[model samples]
Target: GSSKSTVNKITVVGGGELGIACTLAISAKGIADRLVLLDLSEGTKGATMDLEIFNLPNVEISKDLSASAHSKVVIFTVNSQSYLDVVQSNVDMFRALVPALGHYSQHSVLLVASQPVEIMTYVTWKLSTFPANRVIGIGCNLDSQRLQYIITNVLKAQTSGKEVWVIGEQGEDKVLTWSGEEVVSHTSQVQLSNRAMELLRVKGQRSWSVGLSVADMVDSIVNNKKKVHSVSALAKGYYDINSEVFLSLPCILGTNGVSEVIKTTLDTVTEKLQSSASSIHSLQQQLKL
Candidate 1:
């Protein structure tokens, strides 16, 4: 049976890096009847204005979409200018928008694509009081994609349809799982020197690459295909952790957000990744709870 209620509105708050990109991408999909871009920043209006024109020029864009209306999915791309005020407001907004004990039909929230993304998602989850399943960390997804890109380049192979798992913590604590494969080429390698050289060669940190990857993630979730992405999710026994740890694990995403947190096979190298998870857990505990 077709859904009784329709999903017509998708909101994107904040018109900065993630905000503008998410707004443009979602509108391109032609899924929503309305799109809202809200931000406290001055550049927000300009960003929204440009996106509106782009949507208008593209004839295939969705019908009669505007910023001031109800939406099915709300993406928060705003910056935390004042942490204390924003955090309190975020909590209050979710409490008003997403009900506590009823059907939160056709609704989802995507959090800030900034660093400490896991912590932001945790804060949003606490505020909105929505299920942890509905919130996600965008940066973690980008980091996993980056890991896969590096690994694929090193092997001189493609990941078009291959099942390569890049799970566990982000940054220096990342754990790579390569031993479980068929041992093709059997080249035990991680070129740290080359990486250092590359970073040194770059003038500025790559911002454009981040934009492209995040756009891809939002599309995957909206389309609802079974594609796997490493996104920050709560630890509810996915990786044998009993507490809430925000690590990117393979997830099946769609219009309703994460459908399945896929538990893939992990070998010795990957298992050692748990030590970092312990540290992350400890660090999160130190946060003002």
Candidate 2:
């Protein structure tokens, strides 16, 4: 359907369980023609052997940066083995990690799944110097899903297709959206939000879930599905909180990464969203790089 001789090579540029999980899920989906893991840690390499059992044509594990050249989608999950990873430690690693990805796979859309996702998104963008659209973070998308499941249970909704979004900074500050006021009730909403975050806190990385979510997102990017996902994308003008930052906003994903940032009118806590964005911006300002 697309141009021939075009293989959608995807590189998951991190290792350990989360990286292995994303690689396995991506391979399982049959999304990319070729899959490469950038950091072939011994444990992950052993895991790649399991991936090779199914098909060798689509899987690869490499130590060289150039192995990821011409990748269409490059995912970053380094130092993201746990939600409790030290913040500065993650930043320090990406300072060196992102530059290589930028140079080698210069055309690839960078999808970040690292912890402190909102802040690391800005870090990846600044380090790569890629335009905002080419760089994105796996923000509250997972949180939103967790919340949707919980809310559906609370309401006894059968479809679970109700529009749910948890946008803002990644953790603790994410806002749940239903009716701008209350499709259900504020108390339940608060309880629902806490439950989602608490689960992630209890389970360190929730690697399999995150991996599948990343696979889902990369599928939209490679297949050009043009789906809207609430991820940490560039948030500057639309909300009146003008800061050079990337917070979770509903963005349409396609071949060119975030093709559009959908500005739905969630007016109730617009100020709270603004405040959340402000908090992200201030924290971002404190980063060394």
Candidate 3:
């Protein structure tokens, strides 16, 4: 079922590196009819001025939270080195801004891009008091894409109809899954050297890839494509992860936000995913919420 147009007005909160990268990617894709950049820094004023040289369509800059009024989507790219600091920042910001955000919009999807994403996403949900489905973390989407690229390079195969799934945590504890039949050709040898694995992990951490990957997600949501991407959402019963934890899994994203969490049987992949879930659950326990 198609809802209202999801691309009407999109806001990018925070004007730092990842925020600027996300804004550029969203503009390049023409995902939203209007894009608003919000930041408290006067530096963002000049940044937006320089950005105007490109003469992109419907792009604006503002310092007030009210600029997000009537926005269909709000992408948060705020970051902090310490996980505790990130949580504190979000709690304070949400308390101060939620009323302004809620005043004019029917509802808005909150997209989190901070470090320790799963934890921060949970915090966003708690503070914003939004439905779970409407709060999404750009979790293992980039990691899964990197997995496909790494396998393609290792096998020297063509890039058509190749499917790979990476689930669980977004960080180092991510579960990397590749079914033998799907990933390996009958005649091809599967050999991944330690050096190659290290390089692949490093590539997955690049900010540009994250920006592009998130741009793809915004495209799917704005157009109601219902595309499946590995994103972090509440996983309560899908994989016997009894405790409530936000971790990456294949989800069908649409205008209403995450429409469904796709479940699959990975056989041997299950154990690793469970381990990843346990690790994330442990981290969640540390928070007071």
Candidate 4:
């Protein structure tokens, strides 16, 4: 059973645009009775005044782990600062943060949005020692949404019930998928991949979508809506992937986290998935743990 304290508390952990963006998106949904933004960002202080712009008064701004206690959902979504090494510094942050959050909000569902999402997710999972389903990484959720946006607007498709998804990892090696039939025939598989790539390649513009994607996920989990999302989870025993790595899969998001992993047996996608797993695995192996 979900804890009562967790039912209405959501915490967002990070600094800078991504974290601030997530805070704004989650607050706009009004899902959490109380929301916590746990960061030392001076930029986020302005968010406090900005919240009053809506006549709401349930948000907290703090840099301490205690504020995150009993959170229903915890979003870890900060990027590298450009001076220090990317991977190691992120490892250090989670190394310092997850255990405290683990003890404070033992029932929280961790949603990771760190850079190289798959690896950072693995770090959170290993450190927290939470159930496999409780720690999730923001995998290709944004990429999948962007893929659909391309089909709906960029490609100028008249199709209504079309499906588009990006799987594998959240890095450059991510994979894309779509429904089988589009009025009897569809375009080439690689054609849409190219389009999605260019659509997402431009940086500093996709922040809003990333924020919204996380909020959508938080909505499914906080409300226990049992919605399906393409996100990253530890895939040590599924999809014939026996290694300890995280990858994007169709996971059912619920109150406690991923309740189920929907079988997405795209034959070609599977082969490519193993490739990203190995690369992520190699990178993970280099971690100082």
Q: What TM-score would candidate 4 get against the native?
A: 0.83
Error of 4 at 285 (Å): 1.5
Q: How accurate is candidate 4 locally (lDDT)?
A: 0.79
lDDT of 3 by residue, 1-289 (tens): 8888734799887777787788889988888899888875666357556566776778887787777888888887866458666666655665565445655454878888877787777777776778999889998888776676666776555544545567777766446544222454433322442333455666536667778888888888888899988888987786677877787888899888999987564454566666766876776676665
How well does candidate 2 score on lDDT at residue 277?
Answer: 81
Q: What is the TM-score of each candidate against the true structure?
A: 0.67, 0.81, 0.80, 0.83
The better candidate by lDDT, 2 or 3, is 2
Residue 193, candidate 1: alpha-carbon lDDT: 25
User: Model 4, range 1-289, lDDT digits (tens) per residue?
Assistant: 9889735898888756787788888888887788888875565466445544554477787777898988989899766545235788889878988888888989889999887788889999999989989999989887777777777788875554556677787765557765434353335546656666677656333667788999999999989999878899888786678899988887889998999987652576777888887888888888877
Distance from true location, Cα of 277 in model 2, Å? 2.0
Over 4 Å off, model 4: 1-7, 41-56, 80-85, 156-162, 179-205, 265-267
Candidate 3, superposed: residue stretches over 4 Å from native: 1-7, 42-49, 52-55, 81-104, 158-162, 178-199, 267-279, 282-289
Q: Which portions of model 1 show Cα errors greater than 4 Å?
A: 1-8, 27-33, 42-70, 81-106, 109-112, 147-155, 158-162, 178-207, 267-273
Q: What is residue 116's positional error in candidate 3, in angstroms? A: 0.9
State the C-alpha lDDT per candidate. Answer: 0.55, 0.79, 0.73, 0.79
lDDT of 2 by residue, 102-208 (tens): 99888889999987787889899999989899999998877766666655765454333346677777665446664233255658656755665455444334899
Instruction: Report model 1's TM-score to 2 decimal places.
Output: 0.67
Give the lDDT of residue 107 in candidate 4: 88
Candidate 2 regions exceeding 4 Å error are: 1-5, 40-56, 80-85, 150-154, 158-162, 179-205
